[PDB]
Amino acid sequence: MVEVKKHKFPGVYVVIDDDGSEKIATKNLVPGQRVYGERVIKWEGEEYRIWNPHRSKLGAAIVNGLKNFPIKPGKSVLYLGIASGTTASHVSDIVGWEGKIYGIEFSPRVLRELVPIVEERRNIIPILGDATKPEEYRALVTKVDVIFEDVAQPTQAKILIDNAKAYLKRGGYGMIAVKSRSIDVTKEPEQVFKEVERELSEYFEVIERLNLEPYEKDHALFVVRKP
Amino acid sequence: MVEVKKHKFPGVYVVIDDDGSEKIATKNLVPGQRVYGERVIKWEGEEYRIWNPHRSKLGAAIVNGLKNFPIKPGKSVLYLGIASGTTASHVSDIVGWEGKIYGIEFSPRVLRELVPIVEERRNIIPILGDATKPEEYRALVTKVDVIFEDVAQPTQAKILIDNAKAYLKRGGYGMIAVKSRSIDVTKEPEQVFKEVERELSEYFEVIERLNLEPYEKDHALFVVRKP
Amino acid sequence: FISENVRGIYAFDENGNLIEKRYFTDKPEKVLDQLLKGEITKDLEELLNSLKEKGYDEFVFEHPELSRRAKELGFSATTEFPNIAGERLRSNPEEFLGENWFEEYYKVGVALTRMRIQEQSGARDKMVIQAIEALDDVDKVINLLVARLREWYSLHFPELDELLPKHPQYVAFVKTVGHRDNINEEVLRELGLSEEKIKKILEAKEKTMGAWMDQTDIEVVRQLAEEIDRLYQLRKKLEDYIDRAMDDVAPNLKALVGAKLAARLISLAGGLRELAMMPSSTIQVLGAEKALFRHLRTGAKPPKHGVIYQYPAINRSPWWQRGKIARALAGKLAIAARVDYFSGEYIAEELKKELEARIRLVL
Amino acid sequence: FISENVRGIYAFDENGNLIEKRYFTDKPEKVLDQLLKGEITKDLEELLNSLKEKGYDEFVFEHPELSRRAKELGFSATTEFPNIAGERLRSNPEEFLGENWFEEYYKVGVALTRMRIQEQSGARDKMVIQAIEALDDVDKVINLLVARLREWYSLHFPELDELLPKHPQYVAFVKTVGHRDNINEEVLRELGLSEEKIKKILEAKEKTMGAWMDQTDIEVVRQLAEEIDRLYQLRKKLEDYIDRAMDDVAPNLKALVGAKLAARLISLAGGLRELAMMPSSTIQVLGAEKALFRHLRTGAKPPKHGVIYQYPAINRSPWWQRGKIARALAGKLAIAARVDYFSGEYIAEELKKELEARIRLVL
Amino acid sequence: KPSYVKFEVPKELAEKALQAVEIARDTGKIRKGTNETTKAVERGQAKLVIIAEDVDPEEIVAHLPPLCEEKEIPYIYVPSKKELGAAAGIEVAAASVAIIEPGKARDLVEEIAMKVKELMK
Amino acid sequence: KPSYVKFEVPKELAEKALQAVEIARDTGKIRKGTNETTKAVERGQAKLVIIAEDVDPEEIVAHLPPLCEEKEIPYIYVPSKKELGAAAGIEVAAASVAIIEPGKARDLVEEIAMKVKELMK
RNA sequence: AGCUCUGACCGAAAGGCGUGAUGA
RNA sequence: AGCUCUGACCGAAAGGCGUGAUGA
Question: Where is the signal peptide (chains C, D) (predicted)?
């Protein structure tokens, strides 16, 4: 039954899958690969990797109608907390060959599970680092267009602002997913969310906040602009 | 009281002491030097080193009327079993400046007590070594005129023959002092003395045996000559 | 001024300008590891001397240690991030790297990483468990081979036994100083040694109840000392190992209680799988054999001390209080174990903070 | 042909002639110490080849070994004492050495004698006692850092634990072989290793239950090994020392029962003094209460009388008999000690002989 | 859709278990919570180990399934953990629980057993 | 003239001891021989330790003098050993003996005591 | 001669608490 | 818990033996 037609965002596709329903999905950059064991589907000449909102936040972000999305073919993005690559694998599809991604995990065991991928899919650069230290990678990255921060850690608000001065280029965006207990497990979700926004708006302009429900609970994705 | 006049042997001297009696003595090679803490008496210009028979066997053998005595001024002697030096301290006096003694101790501790002495008295060469193995000193010595073996040791009969082949030179004499339980503790001294005489006569011409009583018990000097 | 590339170390003029550059002479992956870490190499020092050469006392770096140990080199430097230089290079890299500059940042990049990541293994939990015990053995061994070199060398110098009670120095004394008469002020200080220490002994050297040794007796004892000294060295490289494999085994446990105490807890476990697989109650009390006496010969009550009590927070905290604090660290440990076992995701700072703020209290 | 001077190594024509010589390029005293004992040095091998230039297959020495290991390397030689060469030199030294030749033989000898002789010390009965316990320690120390290395490396290669049961070769394997996939027939025999051995394990490499290590897990463990194999080096130089100061302490006890056992006996004494000063009854049984410690305390073989029972003659002889032999060597030993304490005079061949023929017997 | 859940439970088959403890709390014991639940599992006091699909961090009980398979015990996921809390002794949440000596509900348990033993492959 | 003899002993004060033993062997013990002689000296059992000036190698008893000045015991050399053997229990030579419990000779002992304490310097 | 920490209840309140209190 | 071998008598003889037999 599957039908596949262009979604609003460049590098995103909508599918009317078996029954009636709608899911998003992205063109596989390297046909034949399968990263996180997700549903590929075949279309005219080509394979589109489904992207499940329950797996990637940024997927859930977009199914919840993320308004504006700086990550588009050709763009150079810095990715903090790239992990296995389940979440960043998809942006690779989007970004494309003249696109470039700088992935940064910290635990060496997880990032490992990525390193073999980057042979087939060569627009990614796994870099074992700590976001808390931007300079440790000072010589492995070039100024980026989008910064992307996942990394559930209390200081994550400042993490973004730091990297942002180091790397993010004037007037490019960056967007962060916040889990809220990452920051403070005691005080009320909106209040931390609201605090986080202020701490950001001190450096950026916070041009959006989007809560990630039903998929993920008590998270929210923000996107900010660098003046 | 003391009067000192020449003995029958070149390099030996006689003294008529405090009261009535006779002792032997040598002209100290390096005035001021005292080896085994023996009585040195002075004479017209020089000193004479008393020689006590109870200490040096060849001392006794000379008070017992050792008949012929190959160790004379100029002669190069191989001294085997040279100990502290009490016993060759004297032959050094006789041998004199153009004379050369090669001493061989085994126990390194005793030899050490010689080593200081031979700075001053530089005609002796102290050599750590084992008479059993003559080659162990093969390159520290040169052919001698006399060999002298003390070394209370069973094979000693052999020891002498063995060295007499490497070192002692044609018609050169040698003299060994035998303790008789050095060789066989059980059997009768005048017996071993014989079996020893025989053992030597296989190689040398046994030109003398002289019992070392009363001074030393059951020892005897032998003189042999080399065909 | 001075920023590092994936190709060479560049120093830029105060405005925009080049000045000079040094290319990585070995494998760039290798050099960078040191440079990125804050470490200073020769490729760098070859540069700065050349920069002094053109008359620059002025110095700026992107890392805090590159500047702080640059001053430990002489030159007055300072730390500033995205400084004029890093900004220059990262701004438009193909200026410096040609058009294929990314394909480059890529190779040096994947290359640097495969270096720092340990190969897939499933035994490595039990490898740390040897290495942790294998350093407790090296600890019997050392107290023992010092016990020897202490009284043996005291024949020759009895005094200095209780003079330099700190072992690593007694040893290096014997190892370099050597004979009792080789010792002099100059080489006594080169050993550590306060201005008094260099006397309190030098007085004893000058008169002593000491026996006498020669170039032979010494030469052996100084050979026992060269072994103590390589055993110490064997210690450094054993923990150095632990603290690097914890990265690949329990990033969290390591980030929580420290790489050593992590590996220790992994030890009286049976490994990680067991450590992970069990309660927090079977954790707080682990190393519990010794708390202390009062019935061995006297009379009193029994209770217990488990390993994790060396947590500086459990330690500087008192009687009354405390073990309520053990109850806690035990739990965050059980969580650390599981994510560490199954995932590897660094969640540490989350529950590190969940713990800190935790169980503030009644006194 | 060949014999050695106080200056050089000469090689003489079959008649009387000089052929060629090689002067001593080091301190002669140092080279002679090696040559006189039968050891071969460069100066001697520099010669041999230079002789074979001139075309000499014929070789004759003055010492059994100079000829043995002259075959162990190339050349065909035979041992003969006062050979044409040794005879030419000592016969008329003046020829080779000038008019002052004695003042020379004197120097090189007195010199060499102060080389082999230790300086005056009253502590060396104890310095030995240290050494002898000091390597009873190095023996604890080695067994233990072996049990580690054994099971630790047996994570990566379980099989070869009972494959190479002989400790030193297990070690050197790990130390050079290193990683599992490094092993091969060629470098496997480089270690000892029968041709069956190189098989029994080589299948065990190919198949295995062994977990995986990388360039890192190894490189620490192959750093354990490098250590065990220097402790071994330390043991050698520990016995190499005992068997030397035993010449300067008790030449006699040494020449009688052996340098080690002589040091052990001095050892559970309290020293040389306390040895010579006690009966022969307090001697024969000594490690009896150190070897009887194996029934009720720790436990082992049915309790073994005495230290001195390690005498090859006490051992190669039976129950019924034996016994009365200890009572004897016991006797000789007390004597050797006093002579040794007081005199040092080497009387050892006497009692050695008085003992040997002693207590021939019933059965 | 947590990744520590082996099989796919029906939302009632669970419920029968969710109340199977509710009254299994009476004339036999239970052991509320995940710390003393893991307790019982290692010591075999575990009859059936019931768990929650809510619990996060998802690794807090992610260890139970392997530990159970090993110790030869049946387990179940009752999709809500707040209900599991109150269905034991007390309101406040229970990530998982297990039952030692069912008591009331004795035969009322292995129902889930015969069903877990196949459904999980 | 052996060098292990400190003091110069009387040609008589000696046989008095050589004969102070002969009948000191009667209801008091002796301990014949040099081995069990050294035994007694280390255990205090020695009253007077008598030696010989003959004995050779001269290092076989050369140890008794030092061991005595230590254990605080008086000692005397009887110029012949063969004598000393017979004067103890048996003909064959005795290099030294000593007195435990003089027995016959109780006070006939310390006669040599006084002398020996003054003699030895 | 070898083994197991304990499992709802501190807070005046606020409500903190099986994602561990309090007792060890 | 922490520390002590036994002292004239084997040999047919020869005579070997406290400068240790025989028994341990």
Answer: none
Question: For C319, phi and psi rounded to 5 degrees?
Answer: -70, 180
What residue spans define the domains of chain E? 1-121
CATH topology of domain B52-227: Rossmann fold (3.40.50)
The CATH classification number of E1-121 equals: 3.30.1330.30
C-alpha–C-alpha distance, residues D215 and B87, integer Å: 70
How far apart, in whole angstroms, are the C-alpha atoms of residue A1 and residue B84? 115
Task: Establish whether the CB of F98 is closer than 7 Å to any nucleic acid atom in strand H.
Answer: no
Domain boundary among the residues C204, C222, C249 is at C249
Type of residue numbered B183: I
Residue C97 lies in domain: 1-122
Q: Cα–Cα distance between C324 and C354 in angstroms, integer?
A: 15
SS3 state of residue D167 = helix
Chains with ≥3 Cβ pairs under 8 A against F?
Answer: D
Q: What is the C-alpha separation between B13 and B4, in angstroms, rounded?
A: 7
Q: How far is the CA of C361 from the C1' of G17 (A)?
A: 15
Which residue's entry shows tokens 């308004």? A67
The count of other CB atoms within 10 Å of the CB of residue B112 is: 21
Binary contact (A139, C120; C-beta < 8 A): no
Residues C125 and D143 sit within 8 Å (Cβ to Cβ): no
> CB atoms < 10 A from the CB of C342, how many?
16
Distance F75 CA to G24 C1' (A): 73
Resolution (angstroms) equals 3.2
Handedness of CA D122, D128, D131, D132 (dihedral sign): negative
Q: Which CATH architecture has domain A1-51?
A: 2-Layer Sandwich (3.30)
> Determination technique for this PDB entry?
X-ray
| Cross-strand partners of C2 | C11, C61
Mutation site for D-interface testing, chosen from B125, B133, B165, B169 by largest number of D Cβ within 10 Å: B125
Ordered DSSP codes for B163-215: HHHHTS-TT-EEEEEE-STTT-SSS-HHHHHHHHHHHHHTTSEEEEEEE-TTT
Provide, as residue numbers in chain B, all residues whose Cβ is less than 8 Å from the Cβ of D6.
139-140
Strands (DSSP E) along chain B, which ranges? 3-6, 13-16, 22-27, 40-42, 47-51, 76-80, 100-105, 124-128, 146-149, 173-178, 205-211, 220-225
Residues C52, C53, C56, C57, CA torsion sign: positive
Nearest of B223, B176, B177, B225 to residue B204 by alpha carbon: B225
Strand H closer than 7 A to residue F90 Cβ? yes
